[PDB]
Amino acid sequence: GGSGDSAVKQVQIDGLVVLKIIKHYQEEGQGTEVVQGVLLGLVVEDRLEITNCFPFPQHTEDDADFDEVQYQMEMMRSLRHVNIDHLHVGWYQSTYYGSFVTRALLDSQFSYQHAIEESVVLIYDPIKTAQGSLSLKAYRLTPKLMEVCKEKDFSPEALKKANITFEHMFEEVPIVIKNSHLINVLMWELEKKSAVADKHELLSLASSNHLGKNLQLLMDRVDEMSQDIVKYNTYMRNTSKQQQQKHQYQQRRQQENMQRQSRGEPPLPEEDLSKLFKPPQPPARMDSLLIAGQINTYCQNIKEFTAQNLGKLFMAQALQEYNN
Amino acid sequence: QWLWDIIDEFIYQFQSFSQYRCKTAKKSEEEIDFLRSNPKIWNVHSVLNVLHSLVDKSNINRQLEVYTSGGDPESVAGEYGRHSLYKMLGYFSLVGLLRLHSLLGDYYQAIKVLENIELNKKSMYSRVPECQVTTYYYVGFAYLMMRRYQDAIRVFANILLYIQRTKSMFQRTTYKYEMINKQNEQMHALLAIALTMYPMRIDESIHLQLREKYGDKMLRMQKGDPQVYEELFSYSCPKFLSPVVPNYDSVHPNYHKEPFLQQLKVFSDEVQQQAQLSTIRSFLKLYTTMPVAKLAGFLDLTEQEFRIQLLVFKHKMKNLVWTSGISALDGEFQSASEVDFYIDKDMIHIADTKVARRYGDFFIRQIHKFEE
């Protein structure tokens, strides 16, 4: 069966949903980190059928401030009046660049997952990651992390919870592998489209050649990836060096000094012994930055892997066509 | 007292173990499947066969140095122990390769090399990484004794690099791990002196500060030295025969000395001849094609005064280093210049970086399986 961890089940996403997401695209604000909207569905055979979606339209330009409650309330009144009810089983984003996890969206996922166990977060990565294997990714969060929710904090919370061990590279649910039995209408369309509509099919394919000759796509994606890898790794490397200089370097000199002082005073305290050792801000375990870092480096490694897979087959095709 | 007495205690044990092994292991599947089924550990059996070979070889060298003619050790080890262990069935597992690895290591130290055509043809079992490293160690020495510099360096490079995908663990290296790595390095350095200019393929196996150090020595040896050859000979002969252990210096014994004198001559005469060829191989093939004045400048470089230049130039060319055409009419000497290439190793390195990440992914996941 399609059951995963806790009570969860594998995702079944309609092609109608994909077309509704594509209409609300990735333009009218290309660079802007807008989380696009919610996913609606229901518990079915072996799986979750994701039947619908709607966007959440915020104050978007380059800026993108949050928006009113009654838009969601009137939309979820309106949606019920046409079909079923507001059974909200996840949320979705594209949005700018190739796959990345901006940190407060992890907290947003953590808050959503504490409320609903049966939930999947959907990331859509097409031409902006070079389209490009694994173009739809559906991810759930770990039960041990959810079980100890709330919270993570800076070093309290985290030091106790992360030293019980929680998984964080976690379940990705596989999407299409059988018929939905809704294909029927699209199948009747297919034999005609083709047909005497051949002009449309041929033009759509021909757009690819224009895109592929014009765009510097392998260099372009490598430059944004190189920029991304250096940003996150330099942030993590300075963060680790800051904790190490507090964990090891302070304590080493404190033991150096405490051994020189020698370290027990028998008629009365122990004044400067009492002064010694008080926590710096990291004494251990800045996991809220670290775990979010590792999820982003895993996303970066996936982008390296998809870029390598594109390069393997392009090198093969280039060599194969020339030599005969 | 003590040191010799311990050798007898080991010989008494090894002879008794051989008498037991020669007796049981052609019928005793009752003994054997009781051994297969009961335990939950297995690596001890590999260690004992290797440990016995190292201890026996350490014991044999001391006896042979002290008693330098007409005594028992080589025949009693050869005829009874090594030949009986060679001639019986291999225990199912890699145990037949382990017995062959001692036999080959004894055969190597007695310099009676030839039977590798037989040994390789009977060694058709899977080379699980440790048995690849042992086989390569002996094969590199066999190629070196055969004077196959091109072949020996490739085999030595693999075990010097040590990325053979070994997974040991459980003290199997053992007690000489550093020494075995330098024993491979020492031969690899000697092979590099013979072969260079052409590799281009030393960077894989020998790290840069040792490529620097043997490069100074190699350039000086082919320009003037004496002392680099003296240094190279004294370090190398120590490692070439693999005697495992010395005895103890004193005024009164001769013995070990007769030992050492035989070892020095045999390595000296061959290495001296090879060193002279390496110096002939030193001068660059700066252009393919030489008219008489360029040939005369090569003769001037080759030797002077005066008498007999061209005659010894025929011999120096026909050692190996010059394949060429001559025209008597046009006065021009026509040769090729040998060539080699690079960006070879990177294709191997992309495979082993993938293995290195995967081994680390396996290790963290194995540790993680205890905190589930």
């Binding site: 890898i229 490694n301 390296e304 892997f305 392009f314 090198m315 020339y322 | 992309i350 970086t353």
Partner: protein, 91 residues
């Protein structure tokens, strides 16, 4: 890979189609609609891929395959260095 299989499936249809188009001319009379028309389609393919033909250009292509392989090799090394950093900070 799915696109490469669609392209090979299409190329095999072209081999079968051109075989039928020629054989129609051999049998009695055929190919009139497929004359300088198909000869322009096949040229349109050939002018784009492989572009031109000489030794200079295939040598340039093989040099680019080595650079693309070098970038791919370095991407394995970056991912392994990220793994070396990963393996140090998860013990």
């Amino acid at each position: 890979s799915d696109l490469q299989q669609v392209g090979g499936a299409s190329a095999r249809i072209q081999d079968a189609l051109s075989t039928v188009l020629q054989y129609a001319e051999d049998v009695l009379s055929g190919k009139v609609s497929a004359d300088n028309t198909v000869g322009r389609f096949l040229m349109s393919l050939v002018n784009q891929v492989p572009k031109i033909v000489p030794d200079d250009f295939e040598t340039m292509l093989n040099s680019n395959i080595n650079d693309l392989l070098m970038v791919t090799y370095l991407a394995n090394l970056t991912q392994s260095q990220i793994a070396l950093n990963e393996k140090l900070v998860n013990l």
